Design a binder for this molecule. Structure first.
Ligand SMILES: Nc1ncnc2c1ncn2[C@@H]1O[C@H](COP(=O)(O)OP(=O)(O)O)[C@@H](O)[C@H]1O
Lengths: 441, 65
């Protein structure tokens, strides 16, 4: 149920030690990369500190050397506390709005405000409801409820009886009357009145009575970013825009006033600012018009730390014509700090394939694992990690239990690795459309 | 003369009548304001003849005739 095995469903954190920052070589999924994971650990421990600006760390490296893996490790090693936002750098080139402003919203999405305030709620099974609608109306009525411990009678206002016939509270429901507003969230049905429910399904869940007192205060903690407040204070009922993307060019005075009230909330002690992480995946797909704004959005007090990943070597910058390292201009490479990765040794390839095999729960003989490591030496991690999922299914064709050499050699036979595909293109020139010609036998 | 005593008409803050703490909810069996579940336990296992004396101390006992 919505936990389908992806290409990164085996990473359960960054995996490094949190006491001496030592990258232990096999923990929580990330296996093999040492120096880059220690530098990511240092960056991660200065994110949770909070006493630094929005800085820029560039995870540069060759393809399939674990860059999205390190970013997802830092995403899993923070929990749902500090806001992590992914941004593949082609969501910026929109048509609903401009391009620099679409980047500004992605900066504002990663600066949370965390405020904690209390509510008063009521648990409990309804014993019975009597409503004095007799021609009368919703004027007076009695509500008898109980927990396992308590039991009580309440009288109701008119604007509560109009919420009781609104949710249709039966004799046996497990409701949560939020006292400060009046909404009723039925948590379920009580088991002891299972006879008293006729208009339900044959398969219907039933709960027990709530345990404890019947009138308690909850300290809920909410955390919303500054872009949330910006989109809220933009129309009449404008929060729908951030669920439908129909927000446009937000005027800058609104952002300035909200940057003032967040500081006034912090100085009164009513609030607390949490700087998040913004991960700009594939940062080489930005033109120089973006870098001339990231060079100055990383200057203010309210700026999240930017982590970004580049594949290209000496390549061209979009918008302009002159080449540069990593596809980035040099005045922006002065800002960033670069972490370089390395290709993988074959034993690390073998144990990464072992983790990817244990994640999908596929049994492997060690001979097939040796053959698969030999393939991954010559065709990369992605090809072998797909040959695993193919070979399990090919073993399931002929009703086998463990995969073997006779199935990896079929998966290697049907599905070409991209090197042999490049050889296929080079040896089938005259029929494949290069630029001009089509020859038909 | 002697009919100058005046009643009231205002919302009253109802307190507990077992203890003196502020109590927000009563009972169906004995109609006692009570603070929490310990006082509810001591209400539902008290010996008979006293659950009416609490309403006697608060007033409106309504003893039989
Ligand atoms: N240290 C590691 N531990 C486990 N799996 C890894 C590690 N490094 C890379 N991988 C795997 O290799 C694949 C390529 O990593 P990824 O970061 O997606 O490559 P790229 O940097 O080209 O995006 C990923 O699917 C990931 O599962």
């Amino acid at each position: 149920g919505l936990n389908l095995i992806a290409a990164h469903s085996h990473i359960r954190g960054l995996g490094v030690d949190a006491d001496t920052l030592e990258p232990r070589p096999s923990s929580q999924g990330l296996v093999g990369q040492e120096k880059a994971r220690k530098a990511a650990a240092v960056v991660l421990e200065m994110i949770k500190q909070g006493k630094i600006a929005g800085r820029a760390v560039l995870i540069a490296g060759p393809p399939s050397t674990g860059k999205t893996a390190i970013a997802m490790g830092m995403a899993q090693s923070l929990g749902q506390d500090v806001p992590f936002t992914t941004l593949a750098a082609s969501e910026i080139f929109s048509l609903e709005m401009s391009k620099t402003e679409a980047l500004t919203q992605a900066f504002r999405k990663s600066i949370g405000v965390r405020i904690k305030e209390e509510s008063e709620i009521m648990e409990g099974e309804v014993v019975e409801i009597q409503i004095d609608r007799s021609t009368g109306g919703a004027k007076q009525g009695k509500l008898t409820i109980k927990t396992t411990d308590m039991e009580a009678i309440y009288d109701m206002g008119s604007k509560m009886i109009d919420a009781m016939t609104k949710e249709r509270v039966m004799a046996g429901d497990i409701i949560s009357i939020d006292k400060s507003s009046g909404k009723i969230t039925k948590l379920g049905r009580s088991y002891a009145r299972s006879r008293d429910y006729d208009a339900m399904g044959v398969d219907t869940k039933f709960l027990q009575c709530p345990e404890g007192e019947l009138q308690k205060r909850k300290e809920v903690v909410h955390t919303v970013s500054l872009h949330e407040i910006d989109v809220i204070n933009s129309r009449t009922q404008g929060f729908l825009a951030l669920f439908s993307g129909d927000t446009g060019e937000i005027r800058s005075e609104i952002r300035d006033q909200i940057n003032t009230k967040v500081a006034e909330w912090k100085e009164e002690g009513k609030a607390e600012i949490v700087p998040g992480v913004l991960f700009i995946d594939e940062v080489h797909m930005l033109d120089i018009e973006c870098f001339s704004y990231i060079n100055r959005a990383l200057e203010s007090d309210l700026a999240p730390i930017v982590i970004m990943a580049s594949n290209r070597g000496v390549s061209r910058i979009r918008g302009t014509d002159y080449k540069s390292p990593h596809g980035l201009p040099l005045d922006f490479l002065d800002r960033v700090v670069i972490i370089n990765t390395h290709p993988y040794t074959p034993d690390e390839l073998r144990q990464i394939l072992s983790i990817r095999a244990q994640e999908e729960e596929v049994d492997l003989t060690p001979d097939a694992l040796a053959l698969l490591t030999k393939i991954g030496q010559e065709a990369g991690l992605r090809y072998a990690s797909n040959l695993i999922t193919t070979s399990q299914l090919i073993a399931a064709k002929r009703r086998a239990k463990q995969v073997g050499v006779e199935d990896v050699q079929r998966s290697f036979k049907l599905f070409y690795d991209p090197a042999r595909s490049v050889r296929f293109v080079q040896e089938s020139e005259k029929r494949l459309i290069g630029n001009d010609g089509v020859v038909d036998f | 003369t002697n009919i100058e005593s005046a009643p009231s008409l205002a919302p009253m803050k109802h307190y507990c009548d077992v203890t003196g703490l502020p109590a927000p909810y009563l009972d169906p069996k004995t109609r006692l304001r009570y603070h929490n579940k310990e006082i509810f336990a001591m209400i539902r296992n008290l010996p008979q003849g006293m659950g009416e004396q609490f309403l006697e101390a608060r007033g409106a006992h309504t003893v039989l005739k």
